[PDB]
Amino acid sequence: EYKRSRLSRNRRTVNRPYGGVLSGPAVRERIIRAFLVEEQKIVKKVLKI
């Protein structure tokens, strides 16, 4: 009884990235981890001289 033609979409979803699958505290940490490690990729390339 989650079927699309039995619940309203606003009642089935949460309006964020990864919502309905990941909570806020988890998605926040994924954002931070992805950003920080992306930064370390290029600081490591710059260390490659």
Annotated binding site for Mg(2+): 10, 13
Q: Is the dihedral of CA 25, 27, 32, 37 positive or negative?
A: positive
At residue 47, the 3 state secondary structure works out as helix
Residues 1-49 that bind RNA (CB under 7 A): 1-6, 8-9, 12-13, 17-21, 23-25, 30, 33-34, 36-41, 44
Closer to RNA by Cβ: residue 9 or 46: 9
Closest alpha carbon to 1 in 11, 15, 23: 11
- Binding residues for RNA, per CB under 7 A? 1-6, 8-9, 12-13, 17-21, 23-25, 30, 33-34, 36-41, 44
